Amino acid sequence: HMADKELKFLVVDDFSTMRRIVRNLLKELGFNNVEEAEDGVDALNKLQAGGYGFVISDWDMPNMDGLELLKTIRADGAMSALPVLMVTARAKKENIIAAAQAGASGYVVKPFTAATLEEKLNKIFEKLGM
Numbered sequence: 126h127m128a129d130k131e132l133k134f135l136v137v138d139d140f141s142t143m144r145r146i147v148r149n150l151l152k153e154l155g156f157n158n159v160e161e162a163e164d165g166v167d168a169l170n171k172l173q174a175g176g177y178g179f180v181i182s183d184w185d186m187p188n189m190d191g192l193e194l195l196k197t198i199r200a201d202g203a204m205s206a207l208p209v210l211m212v213t214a215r216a217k218k219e220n221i222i223a224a225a226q227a228g229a230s231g232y233v234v235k236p237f238t239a240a241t242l243e244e245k246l247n248k249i250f251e252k253l254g255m
């Protein structure tokens with residue numbers, strides 16, 4: 126998977142507004158291959174369907190939260206390497222540690238600017254050779 130226009134993103138958040146923010150930012154960056162999920166379960170359903178190259182995910186969500194989502198992804202043999210960018214209002218140092226240790230590719234705190242998102246994605250792309 127490479128960071129070109131075809132790269133397929135999954136945007137996960139229990140609030141429409143927040144998904145709408147990320148989708149528009151991605152479009153702006155030239156990425157139009159984008160789907161949405163409303164919680165961790167919904168997300169895995171789409172992921173296991175196949176084809177995705179990048180996940181941007183909230184933390185606090187019903188049914189399955191984003192830390193659990195990330196742990197599940199990281200533990201699954203077929204998708205253990207999937208890039209996962211956490212986007213959350215959670216800023217306590219112990220939250221950041223938990224997500225980091227669980228295998229987050231990056232971590233952005235809400236609210237965030239267009240510049241901030243661009244720069245954290247580019248950081249993941251460079252780190253992973255995409």
Ligand SMILES: [Mn+2]
Nearest residue numbers: 139183185186
């Ligand atoms: Mn949420």
